[PDB]
């Protein structure tokens, strides 16, 4: 709980600092992720979206794009994942 | 000449500060100027030009718009003025 609260506070502080500089767009990419392709920030911002996210693949099914919350935020295997 | 240097330095400081805030458009208004129309800023922004300046009224033919300089900054009374 303490770690989650600290992470939430840090993320909100990052958002607040991103708002005070009149800065358009913000890409809060964590340390574990690795943006391999060069056209990430070039192609991603070209869709005029509210919060657009990139499809980060991996060695298995798990990725950064859930397909639906069932009852309490748990991952629900939708028929399109 | 010292007054001119100080005024130019102040204008340069304002311009430099206007680009450290990642802002768009800068309005430098003199103390003796009064904006009668409250919608002047929106109309000026809607002009879609690099540098703009509206026509400030005066009791005489003198205005904030010069029709041209002759050789070294002397006023040239062009017929279009």
Curated annotation (Swiss-Prot), chains A, B:
Protein name: Procollagen galactosyltransferase 1
Post-translational modification remark: N-glycosylated.
Subcellular location per the Swiss-Prot or TrEMBL entry: Endoplasmic reticulum lumen
Residues with attached carbohydrate: 48
Whole sequence portion shown: 137 to 217 of 622
The gene coding this protein: COLGALT1
Family to which the UniProt record says this protein belongs: Belongs to the glycosyltransferase 25 family.
Linked pathology: Brain small vessel disease 3: An autosomal recessive form of brain small vessel disease, a cerebrovascular disorder with variable manifestations reflecting the location and severity of the vascular defect. BSVD3 patients may have disease onset in utero or early infancy with subsequent global developmental delay, spasticity, and porencephaly on brain imaging. Other patients may have normal or mildly delayed development with sudden onset of intracranial hemorrhage causing acute neurologic deterioration.
Organism, as annotated: Homo sapiens (Human)
Tissue and organ expression note: Ubiquitous with higher levels in placenta, heart, lung and spleen.
Top-level taxon of the source organism: Eukaryota
Role played: Beta-galactosyltransferase that transfers beta-galactose to hydroxylysine residues of type I collagen. By acting on collagen glycosylation, facilitates the formation of collagen triple helix. Also involved in the biosynthesis of collagen type IV.
